[PDB]
Swiss-Prot record, chains A, B, C, D, E, F, G:
Binding site for Fe cation 2: 51, 94, 127, 130
Cofactor: heme b
Taxonomic placement: Bacteria, Pseudomonadati, Pseudomonadota, Alphaproteobacteria, Rhodobacterales
Annotated source species: Rhodobacter capsulatus
Name this protein carries in UniProt: Bacterioferritin
Keywords carried by this UniProt record: Heme, Iron, Iron storage, Metal-binding, Oxidoreductase
Cofactor binding summary note: Binds 1 heme b (iron(II)-protoporphyrin IX) group per dimer.
Length: 160, 160, 160, 160, 160, 160, 160
């Protein structure tokens, strides 16, 4: 089914946004793992794998609309150099993604592409979910303090 | 453990090579799925997920050597526009990767980084495995013919 | 139990014939596997393992008759360079073996070695079984055609 | 993948070495069985089947490197005429094989064929394992004495 | 079905041969048991029960051919007075039986009694099996020596 | 199999290094247990038992090469007097061991002792694994702080 | 609980005695394994692991009494060069240990350290157990003779 050229552009931009999130979360997972914050690390791994799912879903929609998925580049990565910074960087990436999705979503509605519109409403919904979580974690980070938060998310020497 | 600067460079190049393979295989999976060649598609999905594993393994080694993993860019993608071309493109990517790995591997040996050396020997071994498979598939493609090969790797209308 | 010198000669010739078949079938298995004709390959592997059994059985009979089993040489191998040729080469080897077994069998009867005679009748029976199969496969090969036969005996990319 | 002509030569020589071991072990199994040394016989059968595995593995590597596996001939067989001699003959064959493998292995390294190199390191490792075992058995043979060793490896009249 | 008078004669002679073997094996079982060679004894018991089966099979064939089975007498028994002698006596009895069976077998063939012929081929086959075993045991006896062989086939004081 | 005198020297040095690690880890386990840091203690016990395995493996290789394993002495022990010091002492011991293994490993390669070489590559790989872990733990120790780290690795009064 | 300085000295001497036994038994296990005396070897492995338990128990008591466990040295090792010698060397080590334990035990009683006293009574009891066993084995060794004993404790070629 031939799709609206601009909807395809939006989908490809969202895809690039996702590919960026995937790598950012995965690096954070690895980084957090090496810091000994296993519990924080597992969450990052999960979020990265969630984005992989979004990316796949989007690539399929692009092909169906007869466009060409472009995974050649990523937007700028934001790698935190510490526990709190990674939360900040991930949150920063979510806000940019939500901005982009709300925009794409409005355009899909205007052009009448119902299915593509709902995909963005679904993505918007998932991203607000991550935002909710990160905000709660950042809030808990300040309340507990650097050491306390690290303790809560660290693994004992005899773990796994 | 501080690592040899050039070993880290090689690891980051191998990582970029892998991130490229991951996306190339995934696009091929999606493309093959839309062509109705489900069986060919599932194989591509598997190979893409194998590369994801390699990438993760490499990022961890980089962090351990105290380097910084860089997933900001991918090498040029090779997207086939048909069944046979995708096999060709994937095979082309394997040869470039093997070339790079044999090079990195020699350098690790020369510098004495035993563990990093074996990682490249492991990657070289896996890639020769994929090459073996692709060559057999390309050979089978020419023997069966375009239609015959597509038939062998297609899914009936009542599938899954 | 001391056996008839010539029966032992026949047994050693049959053994050499079998050792030849074992290797011919095994190479064909490997060759067919690399061609992507897995189903054809599995049959060759089975036949090779059947011959291994015959060989073992014959070596035991030779030792019992107090002779010396000689596995130092094989008769000329017939390696096909393609699907149909391998069927032809295997069929060619069966005919030579049957010829030899019918001869040995008559001699065992003449000399009165009942048990050795039945072993050759058993071998003759198994070989006629393989001949039956190969003839049916060759016939099916011509009916289906090169591509069709290869298709029927090929494995999909997502196999095993 | 086209391979180095000399690596293929080495692989075919190793193959010939293995085909030789297979038959030597199998004859020893049969011989030992007729002597009533069932326990010694079962070990020989196992070792013969191990070599069969090595041979298969090597034939596959040869085909992948686009060479032609040659199973037409075997190196000279060494058939012991008694319990201790068979141990000696098998040990003699191991030393020749190890010599050949260490040589092939060095060449693979020099030419940079990593995978083929590791195959020879794997074979070298397995062969040193058999050598270890045989040396321990020969040592135990002299300590126990001909009759004692035969007793330890013999089966009672009511066995199996 | 009225049978050939001479085939019936042969069957009755074979029967007498078997009734003889049954008792010879059973006495040997008992003797060996009293000597404390339980493992040697169990084998003799098994062989005796095998012959019982042969005898039954033969009596049935005789009745079918409308002849009269005669179990009134046995051929001369051969009772060994020691471990090795019993093996010798049993082996001596096998050779006489095989001689008789090969003779009966030829006659059945000449007269065209197919079924009776195969019975003798079956008996010949079983007897060569026992001969094979006994020869291996006698060989093992000389290799191990009187004491060693007795040890291998003896039961500990706390057995069964 | 007679081995290279100097390879045996290296193996015995590696053995001494391992016997040292075994006792150092075990004392640390006991010490940490008495401090109430059960989780830290269990990890030390595991590492000590890992080294026991290495030691056994090395003693076996020495005997095979016909050398004489020498477990009469240990290198200087490094007993920490507190949580962080034990991590430091264990890390210090790993670096010395890696130094020794890389040296032995190069020599095995030079002399062509393939199997012994791989044992050192295996040991080097395991030790880099422990180093990775200890570095992550030391890093986590400074991030959490003395009290926080002790808390994370301590057992409640109602434990086990 | 601060302990009697001399009790701690005795405990550390007993510890050194045990660390010595551990290594002596383990070397004997390995040696016996290479000789092909698997059954004798498994017993040595068990005894070595028993001593490991004693050592651990003693180190814990030392720490509780606020002393410092010293595993830096071992008493002189006694490595037998043959089956019977290893039994002799192990027995020699037991007698020295018992001598030391009876001495430490008396001192603990005199000073009133009840718990430490019972530990030595427990060790004395276990050691007399090993002595009982070794004496029975040495006696059985002379009764059976070198070859007979080796036979009883050897493993067949098809073992494990
Ligand atoms: C940044 C590089 C990537 C890394 C490090 C990575 C890592 C992983 C790993 C190791 C898994 C296996 C499941 C598990 O570990 O629990 C996984 C699964 C998956 N990845 Fe990736 N991945 C990467 C990129 C991608 C991208 C860009 C795509 C394709 C568009 C993708 C799509 C998927 C999907 C859909 C799964 C789920 C598979 C399943 O569980 O059935 N991944 N990835
Ligand atoms: C020289 C004469 C040979 C004899 C008498 C012999 C005997 C045997 C026997 C009795 C089996 C039958 C299956 C079983 O026991 O489970 C076996 C298995 C096997 N043989 Fe042979 N063999 C011979 C040669 C070979 C050759 C030339 C190859 C390949 C180049 C080979 C490779 C194997 C393999 C891979 C198996 C394993 C089957 C499995 O576990 O799936 N054999 N052989
Ligand atoms: C000469 C003295 C014989 C002795 C001491 C003897 C001993 C034995 C023993 C102890 C059994 C009892 C069942 C069992 O153990 O399970 C057995 C089974 C048997 N005997 Fe005999 N037997 C003798 C003669 C015969 C004869 C003359 C025949 C037939 C002509 C014969 C045929 C059989 C058969 C067919 C069985 C198998 C039963 C079954 O498995 O269903 N036996 N015999
Ligand atoms: C001198 C060299 C030593 C060697 C070669 C050695 C060997 C072994 C082996 C192979 C194990 C591994 C686990 C298993 O087999 O299940 C074991 C277990 C054990 N070892 Fe050692 N060991 C040595 C020294 C020690 C020392 C110094 C101690 C303590 C002071 C010790 C205490 C133990 C304990 C308590 C276990 C029992 C594990 C359990 O059952 O939970 N070992 N040792």
């Amino acid at each position: 089914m031939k799709g609206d050229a601009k909807v395809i552009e939006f989908l490809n931009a969202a895809l690039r946004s996702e590919l960026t999130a995937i790598s950012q979360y995965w690096v954070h997972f690895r980084l957090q793992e090496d810091w000994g914050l296993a519990k924080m690390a597992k969450k990052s791994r999960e979020e990265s794998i969630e984005e992989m799912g979004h990316a796949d879903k989007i690539i399929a929609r692009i092909l169906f609309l007869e466009g060409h998925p472009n995974l050649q580049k990523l937007d700028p990565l934001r790698i935190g150099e510490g526990p709190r910074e990674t939360l900040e960087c991930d949150l920063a990436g979510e806000h940019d993604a939500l901005k982009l999705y709300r925009e794409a979503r409005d355009y899909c509605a205007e052009v009448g592409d119902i299915v593509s519109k709902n995909i963005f409403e679904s993505l918007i919904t998932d991203e607000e979910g991550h935002v909710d979580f990160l905000e709660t974690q950042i809030s808990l980070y300040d309340r507990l303090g650097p050491q306390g938060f690290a303790l809560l998310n660290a693994a004992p020497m005899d773990a796994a």
